[model samples]
Target chain A: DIQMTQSPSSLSASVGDRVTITCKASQDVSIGVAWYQQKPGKAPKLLIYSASYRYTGVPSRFSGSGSGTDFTLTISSLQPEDFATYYCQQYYIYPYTFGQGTKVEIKRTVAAPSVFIFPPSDEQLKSGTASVVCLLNNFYPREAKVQWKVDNALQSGNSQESVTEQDSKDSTYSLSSTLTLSKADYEKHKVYACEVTHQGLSSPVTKSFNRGEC
Target chain B: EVQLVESGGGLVQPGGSLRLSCAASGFTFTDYTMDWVRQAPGKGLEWVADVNPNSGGSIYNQRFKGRFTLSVDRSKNTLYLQMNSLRAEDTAVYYCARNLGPSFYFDYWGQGTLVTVSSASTKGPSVFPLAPSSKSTSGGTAALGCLVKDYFPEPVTVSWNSGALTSGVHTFPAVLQSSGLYSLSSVVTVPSSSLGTQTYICNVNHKPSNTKVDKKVEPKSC
Candidate 1:
């Protein structure tokens, strides 16, 4: 039944930088603090409860501290996936007030990524298995989604997100996603496509590897 | 982040009138749109009404058009939901949301407040064991929450270890639900290092029913 106030409503930080968001309750909340992380278009997820306790699967880098009226959420080193929004909630009493959210945006803006799909190598095909890799190069704001398809349809359970690394010099990011298939399935399927979704692009960028063309 | 806070929650008998209010801040109130939504227990969200700050125009769902009145005080940055002829099914948590950009979807939301409609209540609370938080580890701290629901006549005593619990404890006020019953939750903070070596019990006593309920929490295993 108390009010919660949050500061610096919006924050701009780069990868590897440390950022802290603060929430001040109008009255004492003791340890009733809970922090949430809500990405764009996704429901809010609880990252910490009971002030300093991390939720089961939360990374160690994401920590909460303080008590009573003052609470803080700190990300020791911002990761590529950490650039979204965060809010604090106090459940100590009625109404369970929430702090204004702090949107963690990228400090730099870069161009849309270029997509490249590599077909299976000849040597691996002869060895009874082949792999296809889709790479998105030179993109900023690492909240991109990568999906793999075979023969123009979705290929489930075979897609692996291998890497999401930041370009330290350019302050951009790159992602590598791979799909492994048997030699039979590879030769049977006609095409493999990589679709990239990023904030800068109005529509997804798609590239395909056609077995017959190569 | 744009902010919205809603107030006005309590019990009102059927056929009574109620007024709910919402305050907007963090941005120019006149720059955005305000939407009101409600959800009853075990039911989906129902868009009750909406009001635009600029034109001062209002819209209401056909289902609530008769009983729901939309009022916006643009100068005070506040809005109100005035309703008449309240019914039992009107027991719900109401939220005020802000619609931004071109998306019809609501981006900012108030925490919501619950309103209960009933003729009377005469039931005893049901007691449940406290749920543990993930903080329970050696040398760390953890929280234990005991839930009490479906009671009436208000004013119940919640205790820890059959005795007094002064600090690190938070008790919520009894809330009247749509079912014409009352419920509340009590939480206590403890040290994780003392688990297994010690025992914790939550006791609740209802004066109306003259009933006593005690729940014990067992040490958690990793």
Candidate 2:
């Protein structure tokens, strides 16, 4: 089996720039190759296979090419969502192998998203039908990933909504997502949190709360 | 912002047990399953176990089944793995990762915690020559004996290769010696008719140093 090696471990790029990531095989792998994109706090998604074939539902701008030992995954114009780690895998032989990941970070000039949490209501609280909403407001690039937790566990059964808006005065954009929980959760006195991560921020901004605090 | 950190015992000996812990923060600890994975030195990663903190349900890899136990303390936001009947091969770097909801892949990984299996000595086991013990001259069957001693780090497996020795039928388990070493002996019975015609071999496998020693015996010679 051939071993794969990835180059330029990580790179910084702009939204409209052409981005390319390469993978080299120790031995000729021909066209038996695949590319995957992994976003933080999420599962990896396959983008291309057989060297040049794009997986279903992937954007057309993301293309793969090359043969034998050398291959490349190219993004014609990098999109905000395209900032992530990329991996190459070869399927030419048994026990397929993967290349070291290449992380693509977007160069940022925008401000970090501000996080806020809405506490449970008294009426909704007593009935155990209360829900908490964590908002990530005024984020840039409209591509931030939201993470929610209750008592330190990853939040599930949560609803998220975000609308990109352009401020008339500042010309900045804002986005938000809501994390909801059942009334049973509210009575448990569990702590709820919301975190927003964008390339512009050196660290993610997070807000946590219980009943009376935020 | 979710993160996981691992910490645990640094060294363990064969036939012993060790516990490793993973602390999670900045995320709901009960919603997602925490999976434990390990990597032997210079080897690929192996999935050890996965447990759901909310329900206390766990699933372990086949290789770890019955040997590894997974538990969680929801109040402390920590997950733990306890391994037993430790062997030198169990030495590895362990990590805890969050299993993506309903997915088999890990999204967030914790720094690895190294667990080593070390002993005071590196020499292999000392295998003694085989001997035969005749309980009776007439109807009683003959038994061949092989003794292994001075094996450091404890835990040695002794087996006999002969039609008459079918494992538990006439086998004895290894015992620990006072000097922190291991002593093992296996006795194989010989059929009355084939006593002088058959030969028996005893094999000892000592894992700490990846060593093996063998002894063979013929009833006629004893």
Candidate 3:
């Protein structure tokens, strides 16, 4: 089995872009083909086989259709859960072959605008001593970071932050950052910012809010 | 994304040696391991072995312990596997694979190659299905069978007996298929003239080798 080859080193696309990966057999392998997905550090999950049958437990968004020497793996709408690497294998004969994957990117669009907000809405009483918290919403595939900033100054020590992800309704990635200060500090404070980073996004997002008592 | 392209087909005659190749492309070959498997019409599927390109070592399934070997060419990001003792049994389709991590469960498979065995001339006279028939009875059914080849694998036994000898017989020849290439055949049957022209049986043994429970072939009515 010769190594299956894939192209485009990497790719960037919108959430709904029709993603495609083509695999060619060194020889005519008939219908003996399979596809899989692998997340970093984790075992790969079987995707489609014989270039069509969806392995059990796979989502509907992932679909494949093809046969013989040429096969294709198509993801109709790349969702946040579809960011991992994909591979193809042909079982037509002994040594099987797999295809290189197509790295997918979700582009920022006007249809969905990301909004970051810091605790304590605008028009709140000011203070440097006031405790402020920042929360990020709508992230996927876990792994995010939250940094605290006070009055344009980077807040390192004495600041508490954490990331919590839940799949309840629509699945989301979130981070929480808290800024602690004395009553006097809150009385003279300015701005507090929370920055979060994740693998799915091309850039990190920082949300800032005015510090003060409501 | 990753893609796999297998090597072209190959032809080998009986008693000859051969090695097929399955090379990989598209993606980091060092990240995964590749393997090989076999499937024939009458026979079920078997996992031959696997190779880890990063380490240059290969692991084989117990059934294929010494029958096959897996290797790789890192520079080309391709894996190669070779099987010896070519025979009609080995004529089935052979496949290479890149299964999900150490699990051995093939997640990625390759197109297979069909290896055919062909050789007519040999240096010796093969003894098989040659034990002459005897003890003719009036319209009686007689069953006969013999070893077609010199050797057979374990769980593979041949048995035959007529009414003259009610007890079954067992024997093993020093010759074996392990001496590069070998073949075997066996036959058994029930006698139609036996103590009332009853049913006769010729039994061969193999694992999960479903019993040969076919109805006795009765003699044609006089």
Candidate 4:
């Protein structure tokens, strides 16, 4: 029921770029949205839903913040394991829609598994250094996986950042990453991806970023 | 529009359980809904549970709660339901329903996913799935699984294709595991894009024997 669009189509991130994306519904969906990570050849994993509640067992750095029609998916640290695609999906309607996707990458080197990124897509291509921010909350865990990719290439890994119960009162987790690349360097070869893999929990999640004339 | 057809049977020991499936065809598997119901031998009807071929969120009758988990493959409009903790009292005819109501009522339904609780070696074949969509190497692949117990004699299957299966027989078998109940599964793959916007059918060949049951999926997209 909402029209979602992502820019850049792809992007690049060092171990420290503030990657972010914007998900807007056609009208106003409040914070009735969800975030996800989808990797190649795997299912999608729920990151956040309802705009603030994180799913159980998610990472601490992965934080989501949004209300009404505007939203953000933030990766606070840009871990080596966080090189992948991210997406924003609204759970309020039938035939849910997702951002094109933003694919985050490891600059000049393969980051550590601690820099985990589940799921990939083109939803994070942005200004400054090219990043994505997905926002949403609360959903079922134990149902999917998150993955990554570089440029347009598909890469596979098995490390996951499961959400540890921060509080019995809360059933969600928060985490974030920033993919930094020199303004000039980003223009040479830029593409990013984030993927989430989950079954029954719903469809896999993905976000991609692109580098363009802008 | 998609259609599913199931065929085959399996063996079980006394006090044991059985499960099965009904695969669909000709439709986008992720868009429809599928359900499993029971008709105990000669009993009237027993509502088991329902499955969203895409979302996979399942809801079941409290009476059939601890015994069944409905599942489906959006890539393949296949329905999967299993029964467990089987006793001789659990023997009955089972079926997978299409376009069934989550409100405890179903108008359109599949033939049936028949599972017989018995004390014999039942060798049932795998559920048959039709194909029409070209495999995507550029996209990605998706797999789905379903588990259920308590609902007996019900039949089920998982089917895959582009539209609907106007022809062919799709069948799923319920295999008894070490747990002594039924364990059933169905799988299909499709472009992740089809995960939310496509329609798949889950047909249960029940009493009517000719009805087409389904569950539409609103793919878990974001």
Candidate 5:
């Protein structure tokens, strides 16, 4: 299996600026790489398939070049709509995987976080031990902290955090945190709060989760 | 008038087996190869396998080689994709498409069928999509269509974009199909000035999958 790596994980640019994103494969892909652009909340559109050949209907300003192990996707003149995430995929081997993705965002753009909270499963709740998961998706800068609060008081418990991952489809970073707690806390109607603080965010984004709720 | 419809995406438990069917009409089914493509929830597309009805030959995308079986029924003008020992990850939308000549590109696609791998019994959506087709219209104008049919879920949105435009755009609503999926056509009359050199885009949004597919049209110089 060939692993694909992309550089400059993210870049900020204004409209009309020219930008190029590169992808390197661990093995020779030999014109087997494809480039795709994904707008927020949309399926990715194929820009270049087979490394350099542009898919039908792709704009001329968007071009791709390079082969074997290195490939590049270049935007000659950027459009406001083009400030999304871009990904590179290799079809040269089985179990295909995509690059980490390069987010080309508008310079100085401030984006709020989209958060989701999932309560502990029924089986876990019945066993007197449970964990809740908080997912913060579609946030920029790739840095954030998670805080857990039980009934308005900060509680320190065994917690696990995932490395911030880039959304190939939207160019945003997502990180999830799981907090382990006693089932007694959930059964007692204790409010569990998850707060996220980011460098770009002036205020912390918070969401609450409890047992028996979606 | 050519059409390709995909079927069979009921719930299947892990390690179970399932078969998908693709029925062809209007054109000689044996003239083209039927290709099966899959898309996991919130993931990009993947090519599974293709079977030629004319010669009964088949090819698989390495990743699907041993697990997937491809067959064709020439007498019935149908193609089938059978998979054994399914995993939870196999619970995704499976689509059938007509492979273009001399290439792996799928020019015409069937609506996608959703398959779920769960203990609870439930039926997934039966959806398929068509490739965009264009033709030169009267008065040196161009008409584009983002035709999609046989979708279990209604409510697909189509929008148009272009590098050059003068007149406004008019799109027809989706017409109901006998198979329950809606068949819709959108027309954007590109002015003569915008033809040949301009790039036109048709974006189709499907809600259930929460995915958008875009098609581009660049007319050749006349």
Candidate 6:
């Protein structure tokens, strides 16, 4: 697999500024090079293909150049809508690798968290021990606080990063936390709440799990 | 709660037509557009097509232009990709993803399914993944064997998921057979802890032809 490395992992660019993101393929990609433009919480669209050709209907501002191992995706002039991440992928070799990514921002961008909570299972209830999982997915700028409230009070859970996975397809981030407690504790407290505090959000995004409810 | 599952992987001969499916849930299928991506055996991701379920508007890679079809089954919240003329290059894992459209990005993805387009000549080795049923476990360990049979070439690779198990693995030399083929097996001895709550994965790679497979054994009363 050839590695595609993009320079300046991210940068800040103002509207009307000309931006050129460089990509270096480990091997000859003269045969094919595709560039993509992606905004937070959006799909990555093909901007240019085969190095220099723009895909149909793409704005004139988006263009591409270079051949072999060196390539560049240029935005003649950045527009507000153009403030997003860019990636370069090569078709020249197998296991096509993508450039890490170059995010063009103007001081910022962001996706608030959406939380889903699952109560303990019936089997778990019968076993006298239970686990409740909280998932906060489809958000940007990964940093966020996940809190667990047992019987409406803050408590601790898994300490090892609590499982944060980036969605492979969309490149967004997801966070999950599991609160494991004994059946006696679960029966004693019918209310379990999970909260996510992030920069994209004004306040904490919360979801509660009632033992009997979803 | 957002979820995507792709199905539609099977053996397809050159020039045969095939269809792939993706079932989406936990969101409004009509509100977002669905796209398909395929990767050849030794290749990177390649866009297939995308279709807006609401407007029926769609775009496809020029390569498959007229023959590549994109359809959405809103009734079941599913997306599909149909190809008229398949080729060796089409042999890859096809993944379905969802996006809002235009600005472009695939946020949610299906697990992905493998589609192979090949014939007698290009076909690679056959791997009967995990051998020896629920057999041996003594003291605090187990033996798992990966069998690779009927391979033409000399070099085949066997890999284990340790979580990379290196020291406790043993692979035998090739056993050239009556037919112009060769077979061999690799065994891994692991402490019992990796048998139940955790397990080892067996990966086989037949290099010359991009033929590869992965298998894992589960724990029971062995």
Return the top candidate by lDDT. Answer: 1
For candidate 5, give fnat to 2 decimals: 0.00
Residue-level lDDT for A68 in candidate 6: 86
Model 2 DockQ class: incorrect
- Residue-level lDDT of model 5, residues B51-82, one tens digit each, is 88888898887867777899999998888999
Overall local distance difference test of candidate 1? 0.70
- Please give, for residues B1-222, the per-residue lDDT of candidate 3 as tens digits: 565656533445555677778877766889887877665532334557777788988766565666566778999887776667666667666766676545444756566665655552222212323121222121343333333232222223444433333332213222333333233323222344453444434344432223332222223221
RMSD of 2: 30.0
DockQ of each candidate, alpha-carbon based: 0.01, 0.01, 0.01, 0.01, 0.03, 0.02
**Predicted candidate 6 versus true structure: per-residue lDDT over A1-214, tens digit per residue:** 6788998887766557888899998878674777877654344566887789887779999999999889998988877567677888775453345677787764334777555555554544676665565555556766788888877888864211233234333345555455667788778887887777999889887777455543
User: Which sequence of candidate numbers ranks them by lDDT, best first?
Assistant: 1, 6, 2, 5, 3, 4
Report, for every candidate in turn, its global Cα lDDT versus the true structure. 0.70, 0.66, 0.53, 0.46, 0.65, 0.67
**Model 6 chain A lDDT-worst window of ten:** A158-167
lDDT of 1 by residue, A46-86 (tens): 68888898876688899999998999999998876776668
Off by over 4 Å in 2: A1-214, B121-222
**Winning candidate number (DockQ):** 5
Q: Which stretches of candidate 6 lie over 4 Å from their true place?
A: A1-214, B121-144, B151-187, B192-222
| Candidate 3, RMSD to the unseen true structure | 31.3
lDDT by residue for model 1 (B1-222), tens: 656788876667899888999998888888877878676653434557678888878877667879999888988899899989999889888888775543233556687767778777556776654435232221365555465766875557898887755555545555555555666656565676655566778888986667888888554322
Could you give candidate 2's per-residue lDDT for residues A1-214 as a string of tens digits? 5688887798867767899899999998888887878664334566888899887678999999999999999999976677677888775463456677787766546766554444544433454455444444445555787788778888655544444333323333444444445676565765777776887779877766555442
TM-scores, chain B, all models: 0.63, 0.54, 0.50, 0.47, 0.55, 0.63
Once fitted onto the true fold, the runs of candidate 4 whose alpha carbons sit more than 4 angstroms away are A109-214, B1-222
Point to the candidate with the largest TM-score: 5
lDDT of 2 by residue, B30-137 (tens): 889888867665454455778989899997777778779999999999999988988889988787888654634455678777776865564467655334433112
